[PDB]
Amino acid sequence: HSDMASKMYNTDKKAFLGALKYLPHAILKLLENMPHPWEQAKEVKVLYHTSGAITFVNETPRVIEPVYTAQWSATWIAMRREKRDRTHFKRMRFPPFDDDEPPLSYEQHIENIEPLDPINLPLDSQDDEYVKDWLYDSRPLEEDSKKVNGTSYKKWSFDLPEMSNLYRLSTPLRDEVTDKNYYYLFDKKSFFN
Amino acid sequence: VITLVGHKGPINQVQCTPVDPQVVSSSTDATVRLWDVVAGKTMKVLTHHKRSVRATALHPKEFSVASACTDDIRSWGLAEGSLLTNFESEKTGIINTLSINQDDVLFAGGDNGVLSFYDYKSGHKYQSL
Amino acid sequence: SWRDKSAKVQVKESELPSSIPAQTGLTFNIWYNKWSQGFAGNTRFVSPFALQPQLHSGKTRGDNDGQLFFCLFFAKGMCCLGPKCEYLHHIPDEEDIGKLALRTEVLDCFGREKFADYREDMGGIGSFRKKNKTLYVGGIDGALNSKHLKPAQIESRIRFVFSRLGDIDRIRYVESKNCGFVKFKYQANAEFAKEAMSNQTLLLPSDKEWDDRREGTGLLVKWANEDPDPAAQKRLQEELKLESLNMMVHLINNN
Amino acid sequence: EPPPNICEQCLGDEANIRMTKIPQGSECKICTLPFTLYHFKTSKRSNNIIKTLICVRCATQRNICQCCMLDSRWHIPIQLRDHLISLVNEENVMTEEAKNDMMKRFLSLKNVKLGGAQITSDPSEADNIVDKLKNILLRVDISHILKKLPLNESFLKNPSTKSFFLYNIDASIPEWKITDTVSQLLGILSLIVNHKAKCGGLRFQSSELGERFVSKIRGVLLIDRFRIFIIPWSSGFSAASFGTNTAENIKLSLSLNKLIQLEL
Amino acid sequence: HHIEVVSKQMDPLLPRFVGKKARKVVAPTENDEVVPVLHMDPNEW
Amino acid sequence: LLIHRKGLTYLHLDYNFNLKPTKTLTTKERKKSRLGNSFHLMRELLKMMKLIVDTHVQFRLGNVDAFQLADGIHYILNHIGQLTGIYRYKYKVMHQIRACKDLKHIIYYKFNKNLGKGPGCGFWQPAWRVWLNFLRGTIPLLERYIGNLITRQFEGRSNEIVKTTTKQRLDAYYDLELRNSVMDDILEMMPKARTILQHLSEAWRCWKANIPWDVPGMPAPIKKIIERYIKSKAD
RNA sequence: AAUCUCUUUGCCUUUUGGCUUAGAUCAAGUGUAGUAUCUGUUCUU
RNA sequence: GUUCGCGAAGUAACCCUUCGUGGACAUUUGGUCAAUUUGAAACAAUACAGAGAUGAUCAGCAGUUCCCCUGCAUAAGGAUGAACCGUUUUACAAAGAGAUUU
RNA sequence: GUAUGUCUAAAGUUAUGCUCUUAUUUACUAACAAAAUCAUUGAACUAG
Numbered sequence A: 001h002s003d004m005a006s007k008m009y010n011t012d013k014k015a016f017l018g019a020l021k022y023l024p025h026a027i028l029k030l031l032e033n034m035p036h037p038w039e040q041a042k043e044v045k046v047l048y049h050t051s052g053a054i055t056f057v058n059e060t061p062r063v064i065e066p067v068y069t070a071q072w073s074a075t076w077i078a079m080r081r082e083k084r085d086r087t088h089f090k091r092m093r094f095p096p097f098d099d100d101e102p103p104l105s106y107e108q109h110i111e112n113i114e115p116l117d118p119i120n121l122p123l124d125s126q127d128d129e130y131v132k133d134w135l136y137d138s139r140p141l142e143e144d145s146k147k148v149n150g151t152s153y154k155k156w157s158f159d160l161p162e163m164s165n166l167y168r169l170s171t172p173l174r175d176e177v178t179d180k181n182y183y184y185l186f187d188k189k190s191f192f193n
Numbered sequence B: 001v002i003t004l005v006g007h008k009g010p011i012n013q014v015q016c017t018p019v020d021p022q023v024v025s026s027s028t029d030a031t032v033r034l035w036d037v038v039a040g041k042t043m044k045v046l047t048h049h050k051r052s053v054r055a056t057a058l059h060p061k062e063f064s065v066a067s068a069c070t071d072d073i074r075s076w077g078l079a080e081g082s083l084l085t086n087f088e089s090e091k092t093g094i095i096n097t098l099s100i101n102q103d104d105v106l107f108a109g110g111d112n113g114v115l116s117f118y119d120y121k122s123g124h125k126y127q128s129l
Numbered sequence C: 001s002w003r004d005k006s007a008k009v010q011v012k013e014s015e016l017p018s019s020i021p022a023q024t025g026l027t028f029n030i031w032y033n034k035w036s037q038g039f040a041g042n043t044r045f046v047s048p049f050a051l052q053p054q055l056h057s058g059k060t061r062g063d064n065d066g067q068l069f070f071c072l073f074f075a076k077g078m079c080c081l082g083p084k085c086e087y088l089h090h091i092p093d094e095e096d097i098g099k100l101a102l103r104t105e106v107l108d109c110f111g112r113e114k115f116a117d118y119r120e121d122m123g124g125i126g127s128f129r130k131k132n133k134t135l136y137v138g139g140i141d142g143a144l145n146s147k148h149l150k151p152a153q154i155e156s157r158i159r160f161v162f163s164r165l166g167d168i169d170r171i172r173y174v175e176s177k178n179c180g181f182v183k184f185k186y187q188a189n190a191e192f193a194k195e196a197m198s199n200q201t202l203l204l205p206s207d208k209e210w211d212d213r214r215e216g217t218g219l220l221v222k223w224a225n226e227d228p229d230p231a232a233q234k235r236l237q238e239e240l241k242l243e244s245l246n247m248m249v250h251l252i253n254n255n
Numbered sequence D: 001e002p003p004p005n006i007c008e009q010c011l012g013d014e015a016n017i018r019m020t021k022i023p024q025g026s027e028c029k030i031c032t033l034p035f036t037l038y039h040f041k042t043s044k045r046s047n048n049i050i051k052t053l054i055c056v057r058c059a060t061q062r063n064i065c066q067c068c069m070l071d072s073r074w075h076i077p078i079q080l081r082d083h084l085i086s087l088v089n090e091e092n093v094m095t096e097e098a099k100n101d102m103m104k105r106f107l108s109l110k111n112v113k114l115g116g117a118q119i120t121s122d123p124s125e126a127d128n129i130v131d132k133l134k135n136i137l138l139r140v141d142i143s144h145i146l147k148k149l150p151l152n153e154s155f156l157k158n159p160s161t162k163s164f165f166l167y168n169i170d171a172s173i174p175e176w177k178i179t180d181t182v183s184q185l186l187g188i189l190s191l192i193v194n195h196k197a198k199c200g201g202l203r204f205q206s207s208e209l210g211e212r213f214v215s216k217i218r219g220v221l222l223i224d225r226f227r228i229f230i231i232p233w234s235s236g237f238s239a240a241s242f243g244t245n246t247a248e249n250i251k252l253s254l255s256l257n258k259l260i261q262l263e264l
Numbered sequence E: 001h002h003i004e005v006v007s008k009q010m011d012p013l014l015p016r017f018v019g020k021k022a023r024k025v026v027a028p029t030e031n032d033e034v035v036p037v038l039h040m041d042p043n044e045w
Numbered sequence F: 001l002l003i004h005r006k007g008l009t010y011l012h013l014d015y016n017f018n019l020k021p022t023k024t025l026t027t028k029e030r031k032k033s034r035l036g037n038s039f040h041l042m043r044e045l046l047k048m049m050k051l052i053v054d055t056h057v058q059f060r061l062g063n064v065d066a067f068q069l070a071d072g073i074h075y076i077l078n079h080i081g082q083l084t085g086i087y088r089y090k091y092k093v094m095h096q097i098r099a100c101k102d103l104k105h106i107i108y109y110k111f112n113k114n115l116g117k118g119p120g121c122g123f124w125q126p127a128w129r130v131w132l133n134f135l136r137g138t139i140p141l142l143e144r145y146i147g148n149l150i151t152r153q154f155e156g157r158s159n160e161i162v163k164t165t166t167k168q169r170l171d172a173y174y175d176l177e178l179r180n181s182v183m184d185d186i187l188e189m190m191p192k193a194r195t196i197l198q199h200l201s202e203a204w205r206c207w208k209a210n211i212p213w214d215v216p217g218m219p220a221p222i223k224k225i226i227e228r229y230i231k232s233k234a235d
Numbered sequence G: 001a002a003u004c005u006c007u008u009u010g011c012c013u014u015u016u017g018g019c020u021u022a023g024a025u026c027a028a029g030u031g032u033a034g035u036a037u038c039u040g041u042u043c044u045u
Numbered sequence H: 001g002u003u004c005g006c007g008a009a010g011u012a013a014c015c016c017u018u019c020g021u022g023g024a025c026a027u028u029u030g031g032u033c034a035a036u037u038u039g040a041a042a043c044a045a046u047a048c049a050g051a052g053a054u055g056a057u058c059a060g061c062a063g064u065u066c067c068c069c070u071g072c073a074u075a076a077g078g079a080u081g082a083a084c085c086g087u088u089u090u091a092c093a094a095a096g097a098g099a100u101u102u
Numbered sequence I: 001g002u003a004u005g006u007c008u009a010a011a012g013u014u015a016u017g018c019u020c021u022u023a024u025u026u027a028c029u030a031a032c033a034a035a036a037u038c039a040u041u042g043a044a045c046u047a048g
């Protein structure tokens, strides 16, 4: 559907116009499923129109909250370390491509290139023993029938040493205020008042 | 949901009723129309009035409607669209409003500022004020 | 007979012309598939393709599938499917005319829907209100690449190129107008011949300009108006009376 | 919206038909207004789809099938039906059709019957018209080209001729009837006829075909009791044989007419 | 003749009503029956 | 396709979703090509999305490493008001832009505690959430807006548009209703109405000028009708 | 008993079709040109 | 194809192997749509002209219309969006006078 | 200077006294026009 010169595309052209009203939804689905810094690549299920008018990412980015908190914490530490140690952090230019440059063909220019390393903070063999083997997976423990309800990825159940390891990895982003009196006159109701 | 088309000019008053004709309307085209709302057509066109039928009033105790144009008040049976009575409205001029109470008193408010009270069944004008 | 062989591929798929027309403006409109921001005097062009009845005709999948409609591209000499075509690849004849009878009232022999009114230029599919069997042959000048030719020779060439497309009722060349009228026996053959001869060239391999055939604009084959000639008009009325007589028998038989 | 007016001939002889209904699916060919489209197939395996091309209102006004526009009772075109009713009623009934889009729209909204739809919609009058139709049913260079035309010579066994000259052609005769009758005689052929000349020429594929043609009965050939006369034309012909312009063809036709009237 | 009427599974990207458009239309008046005007009954104006 | 169906071939949509005329447009071309907020908002959303996808593409090509990718994405999500014109067409989006600026402030000062100024903060999750929530509410709005635009493309514009009584029409509509009422009262009192109402227009001009309005030979009841309606307009 | 023309009466028969801040303000100009126009003189009549 | 049952050949006989044969399983896609001229998109280009109420320059807001365009639009804009400007004869009678006619 | 409107003209063939010469007065219109006092300066610029 690159060039729809032939008359055979007359119906597909109308389908393209018809897909425009749903384009914001497709954009949301694409963006909410964006790969996180610890993921090199991410396969997503998509629902596509047979004329090629539109492609919707058809899945929800479900995560285990203490795991996701630890993943972002490890990323946070790795990023601070990289900014500290890199003498020249060359920020990339925007937009990345010229206005005249047509979008690259995935299968011809991207699919064959070996992906670069993601942001993976080096975990310790012993202090992170319980988390090291799976922390940076796309959907950690999705196949472990003991830790997760199943590939639908809806419920999780962890052991004490794993929760301890996630809590410890999360220190930069986790909440540290255990005393409820900390919020005296600094809580929802006092703001309402 | 429904638009009733038929009048040839501005509509002055509309009255709803519980059964066919469920809508009764009066117009500047000098007619009173009884409508079949489901069909969207007039059940009956009453053409006796010479001038704009400004005012109408449903009788609260019987299935009849009063209507008026200058110097002309008439009563109509709604079950069949039949002329019931011609009131003694002579020389009362433009009538802006009609009202009927449960005691059969019909009130006609003149644009000249005269209050006319009539006996609904006979059409007799019993008071001018 | 065509029924003895399989249809021949007239033009290979790779040889087909690209769907993008010749440039006549600054920008190609990707919706309408037409050039914009410009103007031209005459957009017509001579058809690079031509039907050859004796050579191209043959069986297609349509014959086995029980297809009724003829192939539009076959008529134009440019069908790339050959024997695998879904539509019929031969000149319409009485047997197919008979099978088309119930649809021919509203569809042409190609299965295209007829209109209530003719185009203001009389081109196109044609009206369902008239059983028009007569074609108008204009553009003879361009079809001959402006070769000076005598009226009888023009008439002979038209008779040759059209008689091979079905049974002919009559042909007339009007030199006073440099236009021809071809009347067919069946409407489906007039429809088919119209599509086949549209934009064609009247030149022959015995002509000087044969190599320049595609320079100008081709033959303009359109539907013919009502013939004003009283001599034709009276035989038209006699045909109407014959058709009505032949129909009253069917009415009295049915009822 | 009343059900669609589709005839038995369009539905076909199949036991059951599946019909797809699409509200506002199409623009009526007659009135240009939108209508509920119905499309179906005579059989699930048939290769064609039959669609209602006109709305129920236009079909009802004309008493015709929505799928083929033939009369719903007589199953014939509107034009022929209106002529057949004209022949018996003498009233000369006709279905006039609007040209302007606004008028087409306006006309389609009238609750009336157009042309012969009056007669054909009421079966009583249709029968009462079939009976009456039964009573109708039972009841200048010619001086040069005349030496190019073979008129001096005769129809003969001996001379082998692949080409022939035809004259006394009535203008009613189409070309295909002439080719067809010659085909019948030969048990199966380039024909030129100029109807303004009322003559023509016939050229065969090879000499044995012409010899077989001359073997069957200046000679004569029959077309519905029109007596086309035939002469062997040894000198080859072309379209120029009958004149270069219309006036020459007409003059040639008058000359041939008086020659025929002398021959008879 | 028994016809089984079924609704088409429309493509959600295409217009649902192909024939739907904005069209001005002048409708005719149906003069089926006469409605009597029953009107039963010096220079100041 | 939408641009070309409208016949605007003189407008070129760049691959970065910029829309520019390819020549100087006539006033009629300018008026006809005046695309609305639904189109422009959709285009700016496509521009934002392409910026993000292109950054990931740069990483997959191997042109930028994962830290430059994270920082680039965070930069994009924090600079939407600079990298796109989205605020032009839906100015309420400034709330999202402000939220992202505020998040950057709290994030950077947490992140940079012992690092100082410079690129490198790739914690894009909060700004990313802000834009996802923006889309949640933009979806029904654009579905309606674009659906209407495309409906006009296929079906054309409605012929039965009823103009409302806005401030710019109040006097004109008031005049229409006043004249209709005066005419009704006069015609019903009498045993060319447009000529009679000229006296109403004159009585209003007389009232405005404080000139006494008096027409010799005018019927007394009609004078009283005009006078009361003039007083109602005056009030 | 039937024409024609007068005069009166009747008919008004090409017989003023909205709105706001009278909707608002302005009405001093060189050269050359364009269009219309003015006095005079012969000429036309 | 698979599988259940039966005949048979191979084997000393089973397992297994092949040829034959019956049953079970699985059961009607798709098109309102064909691929450049002839069933319909428009702008633009060349020329001339340069916006209603005016002596002059202008803000407007409406209405009527089988004209609509832009716009998400019941907002607003499009020269006050445009068109509006022409043509106009009979419910025709009463009273009276002076001339015309048998 | 606009808005905006109009034009674009073969062929791609459908059958049969009252005036005149001419020298002025007056009005209206002109995005036509770099106009001499009050070490070189209105200067390419204004539209519903």
Ligand SMILES: O=P(O)(O)O[C@H]1[C@H](OP(=O)(O)O)[C@@H](OP(=O)(O)O)[C@H](OP(=O)(O)O)[C@@H](OP(=O)(O)O)[C@H]1OP(=O)(O)O
Pocket: F078, F101, F104, F108, F112, F116, F117, F118, F119
């Ligand atoms: O203007 P400043 O007071 O110097 O602050 C700047 C500024 O941020 P804000 O103006 O939004 O507060 C930069 O943002 P931009 O001007 O580019 O929009 C930001 O750099 P980024 O582009 O990475 O956002 C930079 O951050 P950095 O600390 O890395 O220099 C930050 O500096 P400070 O907030 O630390 O003063």
Ligand SMILES: [K+]
Pocket: H050
């Ligand atoms: K101007």
Ligand SMILES: [K+]
Pocket: H080
């Ligand atoms: K204005």
Ligand SMILES: [K+]
Pocket: H080
């Ligand atoms: K305006």
Ligand SMILES: [Zn+2]
Pocket: C071, C072, C073, C074, C079, C080, C081, C082, C085, C086, C087, C088, C089
């Ligand atoms: Zn084919």
Ligand SMILES: [Zn+2]
Pocket: D028, D029, D030, D031, D032, D033, D054, D055, D056, D057, D058, D059, D108
């Ligand atoms: Zn219709």
Ligand SMILES: [Zn+2]
Pocket: D006, D007, D009, D010, D065, D066, D067, D068, D069, D070
């Ligand atoms: Zn039918």
